[PDB]
Design a protein around this ligand. Structure first.
Ligand code: A0K
Ligand code: A0K
Ligand code: A0K
Ligand code: A0K
Lengths: 440, 440, 437, 437
């Protein structure tokens, strides 16, 4: 009635209740009905949410994902659950099991990748484990013995196969790989995707957050282009109608390289690996900074086919705040943009949180996935990265507004920015995980 | 390391994580390895722990239990999970499916009962539901429409078949029905149980909490006596070697009748049912008070076969504090006994909690189930009943010490009284449920 | 900017900070600027708020109030601080130091009383002291040794001088003694107070009326003319009401003090009297109740008629008990329903001082509608003592949510939640400190 | 009885209650009975503790300290309250009002300084004020308008008069100026202070030695003989040390104040100077460090030698940054290992003031081993600013667990957790209030 919010203990309990309800055994669904499989960067957040509940089970989540890693190091963005068909495109449509030389042998997966937040999840598991007993430390340390090499091959695949020209930015061949499927970031690149003869498909709820058929036809056509060259890394530059450098993905990778490097020093991993990681951390920091607006510090994506900077007003333009590297004066301008009336300081926002697209941008749509709504997962990543920059009060304020928004217990993936209405899929594992990590 | 306790939010999260991990679908195991089935009074506490997480799932827990209710109204103490054999005595040994005319038709159960805390769980679900929306109230109210009659038949079976002489005390035919299997309360009655030819069985861990073979032979022999008369209520007085009036069970039933009566008035249930419930509430209140020591107010059990009051120093002698009814001066003496050096005020206790047996009793064993250890479930029941008597500060202090003891996150069924070592089965659902209910 | 509420720890800190800032040394002001003196039932609540901070200082608060007790046992409603003349009426107007044979020496006080919540404060001090160990228990026990007799004389004066006919209800000679100055409860009794020639003496939506105040001051002239003599007041006072809310509080207080007296081995004759008064005033409260709804009525002794009004005072029997089962259920339904806590426009699930559907309701005017944290606290504490754990918890929860702006207002607008009246009110901080635990 | 710890809300309440009880009006005593005056870095911490309770009163605390600033910019370490002579040495002994040309008018102060944590307090006030809305921001901004110039003159006096050779380290003329009076850091420098004829002037395990105190007072005689003249002190002082911990705090403070100055559009020349000092003192701190372990060393200017000791001051470079990557990792390993936070007998995971394995360690003696909440607070706050979120959180967590007895002791026994020394210490309450949020 008068107050529908949960207390912190009720909220923590309900978040943990959801995470365990979404557990199929050794993988956690991204969401029970919409996304009934393991998604890659969701699984990293799930591992973060499991760490305060069970270090052993958090480690199992990353083990399951890394058992689906391709032979070339790519972590695919979906690991399908042995039995479920309530999602399209499914294993039959990707056909990676038959076409992809590098596909894993006892897992069904997609053929594209997703942001490398995984090292951040490894850090959170290790921080939790060190506060628990010796036996919990041993569990976390055995995971590192077993999976350090796999984590290196993941970072190396990105550094070498998605940055072939050592520009320090990650090339994507599908908007799905950015994690922000329908971000205005990718509109002009998608306008240059022309579907050919497209195999007959079905569907993949509220229309104001319902794909868009023309948009979805383009998503599926990129799959056809990859399948035609059997997912061969070497051929994709020649055939893909979509080739972008993702500056937000690149900044995340810079941070992840630095985090994994620090892990490798703390746990006496090979010196040559730690050196490679610090090298990539700096290269991708510099590649992010090279994209930035000279007055505001805002980061731009790059259309590799058109050879054009992509100027849009989304949360991705704050990529440099995550990895650092801007000159002092430009970073102050960028923080001013973040806090001002185009983003967190917009007067109609219910919470002091980062909308996915600026409310004043012409591309803004308050209900439409990444075109405006506030995503707890982005709140979490900015808060954690800000605390790492030393901006304790900034990170605290994001956490506090994030908890206030989450306190209805809907665990929605994203929220209407002006009304706070929970939108889209409820029961989203990574929102439960963000809440659990914040509540401590 | 320096502090192994969990914060309140971490503890609430881990308690909810455990409850969902023990969920088989529509029933929750009492404990995943020792007790991998639904136990009756555990299931009432589980429903209490589920109510803050999901009213719909809490209602499902009681629906599953009441679907196993016998045709005469008895709620059996175990409802076996369709597939599991890691417990003995199992469905084959009870043979209620073949022998018991009143056994349910599509469930396997035991042939004895357990304390009627179920109405208390119904009250907690309704209190939670009323703080949530209209749709959650509707779920709880439909449960009452569907199950009010079953709850009445349960209370009526106890009032009419286990108090045949309207003495206002419940007769038990097995110590297992008290919930306190090996309490010193039952030693002298068990000494008069002489096993005959006993069918060959196997076993049902640390020896200081390991049944006792002679004790277990007597438990199993009572089953043979019930099976020989096909669980017929009318024949058990003539054949059972164990027949006790349980004053703690009787006080719980008094409270439960009063609670269910108040529920029936609030939700406009039949007037004749509410009248019957208030009648039983007073009859069993008076029956508890009739047993009490004239100086200390301490309640005694009664051996129906020997026609002897059973004088022991266990937590059961505080039965009158739960249901009320003592003269003012004797209730003050009883509270003095509870708080003094024989129980909560004993100088060697780690927590200000109620040991199951007095540390100064000769029957005291600090590790041995109900012969001494502190059980969170008993802490919960006394705290809740005390708050209902209006003793807010007393109930608060029990809750606070209970949370301090539970804060290691072991969720043990019982704890060593002097060291606080968690004992016995870990991962006990009803301890997780007590914690969740306390934390709010 | 986006969320002006304080966390529980910030709110507890600010509450404690306010209470200490209102401390003059041995007394705490009811509110620093509007009420810069010690008020009687405010001081009991302040002692409750101090008990988690310092058992010794909570005891001092009660010691200071009891040092102002009148020779006949009466606790006066104002104990004036050494000399702020920003409050009126002050010592000169009351003239108790010269006219009242029973006034204390070396304290300046008023000549009227206020509700006896003091035993409840004593219980909370003892409960805190028992969680704090040996030397803190000794402080609280020495207080009982020092003041048990004075607390008895307070309760005896109420029972014997303000219930002369042993009706089980307290008679008041001024609406100020109810604690609810301008409650619609007293409108018809004040309407019959016709004053004579009277000696020369913020937001108007929150203060009583200038015509209402000539009546308030005229009653004082009547008491002064008979030198505040107990035996003469029934002959002269133009205002004589039996206050059923005051009476229910007294019944609870007697029961509470009787239990303290048993726990600390006070004289058996005192404990017996306290139980007798607890039962007498319980019955007196029940005798006023509507037989359908259970609602308690005040009684105008001069007019010889029941005062039927729709205020929170109707719920007096919930505090002390004693209603038949069916009639108490009906009274709870009234409390929870749309005339009170269930009114659809209330911001919080809290008890408004007057029913929003009553013609007497005024959403900003003091006791004519606003929600008072001190009433919430008293209802929640009495409900918990009845065993209504969930009802008590809901009142506490909503009271904390309402208080979490940190204004510590004495009362709030029932629809918008706007803090009203005096800010920085000591007993609102005390309520918050006791709730937060 | 079974659990004497307080809940977070009870502890926040008691902390705020203590702070207000130590308020004299415009200054807060460092501790009511042992230190009944305003101390300089205590006052900065008090301002931090007040900021959640009242931005206006936190600003007053800093306003009062800055009103005692010397004409040359120096903030003295004691500002005496109107007249409690229970502290010694007091105004008569310091004689600054008569001898010191730069002493303030109408304040009585000491003639020495203390570490410059003041800019950190200003940052916390501003951060609180920005969460509280328009009129509270205006209070904090008006403070900056009023006192920016004075804060600059404080930092300029340190940089120019206490680092005359532009070495990037602050010179001290008294161990009292380090804030760590009896730290083993100063043992060999004090051993070379040989006093002359000196004017006539609790638990001994927690206080410095009577021979140690003749040296403390002799240094004062030397300063007085040259009338506290900055230009003459290097010629006369028997004690001249470069304090690497003070220097690291200064570097942090300069950086913090530079960022404030940018955020509120202070003069560009001030901001530039503050960044220059922040970098100069960072480098000066790094120049003292052991190349294997990173541990920072103090320097005895008279003896011309590095002071190698095992105290928490060794960790100065963690506060301000600037160490090479490998050397900072080694220093963190020292901090976490068995010589400090990892010593197996420590009750809490907290930084002891002296290493328990050092021959200089004394578990009850002041800065020779005990754990000081104010050091925990400063390390945790600086660590969070380095981006070490988890390390900062662990220090805060253990500090709260240690503080949760509510003694508010200045320091604790590192093995048993026994509160030691003065209870009711304002800056321990302030630390708790800031942590609890
Ligand atoms: O078709 C929807 C899929 C495609 O991968 O994407 C959405 O749900 C995923 C699972 O929660 C997230 O990983 C993405 O970030 C989000 O955009
Ligand atoms: O053999 C052990 C069984 C027999 O029923 O009993 C124990 O575990 C049950 C399930 O947790 C509880 O219901 C009982 O109270 C407790 O004594
Ligand atoms: O006219 C104002 C005075 C006069 O007694 O009364 C008001 O303030 C008092 C001090 O807070 C309370 O004690 C009363 O309850 C409240 O009505
Ligand atoms: O001799 C005691 C004085 C003299 O300055 O110093 C101690 O108490 C001060 C007041 O709390 C602190 O400021 C110091 O840090 C601490 O060492």
């Amino acid at each position: 009635p008068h107050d529908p919010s949960f207390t912190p203990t009720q909220l923590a309990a309900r978040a943990a209740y959801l995470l365990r309800g979404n557990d199929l055994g050794t993988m956690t669904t991204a969401a029970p009905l919409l996304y009934p499989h393991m998604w890659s960067w969701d699984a990293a957040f799930v591992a973060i949410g499991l760490a305060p509940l069970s270090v052993e089970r958090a480690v199992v989540e990353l083990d399951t994902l890394l058992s689906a890693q391709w032979r070339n190091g790519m972590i695919p963005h979906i690991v399908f659950a042995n039995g479920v068909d309530g999602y399209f495109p499914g294993p039959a449509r990707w056909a990676t099991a038959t076409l992809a030389d590098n596909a894993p042998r006892n897992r069904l997966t997609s053929g594209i990748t997703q942001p490398p937040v995984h090292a951040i999840a490894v850090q959170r598991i290790l921080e939790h484990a060190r506060t628990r007993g010796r036996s919990t430390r041993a569990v976390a340390e055995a995971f590192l013995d077993r999976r350090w090499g796999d984590l290196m091959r993941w970072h190396r695949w990105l550094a070498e196969c998605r940055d072939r020209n050592e520009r320090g930015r990650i090339t994507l061949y599908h908007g799905w790989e950015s994690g922000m499927d329908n971000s205005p970031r990718w509109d002009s690149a998608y306008a240059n995707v022309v579907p050919g003869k497209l195999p007959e498909y079905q569907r993949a709820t509220d229309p104001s957050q319902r794909p868009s058929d023309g948009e979805y036809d383009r998503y599926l056509w990129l799959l056809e282009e990859m399948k035609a060259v059997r997912y061969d890394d070497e051929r994709l530059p020649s055939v893909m109608s979509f080739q972008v450098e993702d500056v937000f993905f690149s900044a995340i990778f810079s941070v992840a390289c630095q985090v994994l490097a620090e892990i490798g020093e703390d746990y006496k991993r090979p010196h040559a690996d730690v050196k490679d990681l610090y090298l990539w951390a700096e290269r991708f920091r510099a590649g992010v900074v090279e994209t930035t607006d000279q007055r505001t510090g805002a980061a731009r994506d790059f259309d590799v086919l058109a050879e054009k900077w992509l100027v849009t007003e989304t949360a991705a333009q704050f990529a440099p705040l995550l990895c650092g590297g801007l000159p002092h004066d430009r970073e102050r301008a960028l923080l001013k943009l973040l806090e001002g009336p185009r983003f967190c300081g917009h007067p109609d926002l219910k919470y002091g949180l980062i909308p996915s697209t600026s409310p004043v941008s012409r591309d803004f749509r308050p209900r439409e996935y990444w075109r405006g709504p506030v995503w707890p997962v982005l709140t979490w990543l900015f808060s954690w990265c800000f605390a790492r920059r030393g901006w304790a009060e900034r990170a605290r304020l994001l956490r506090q507004e994030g908890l206030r928004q989450a306190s209805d217990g809907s665990f929605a993936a994203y929220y209407e920015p002006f009304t706070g209405e929970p939108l889209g899929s409820m029961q989203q594992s990574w929102t439960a995980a963000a809440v659990l990590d914040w509540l401590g």
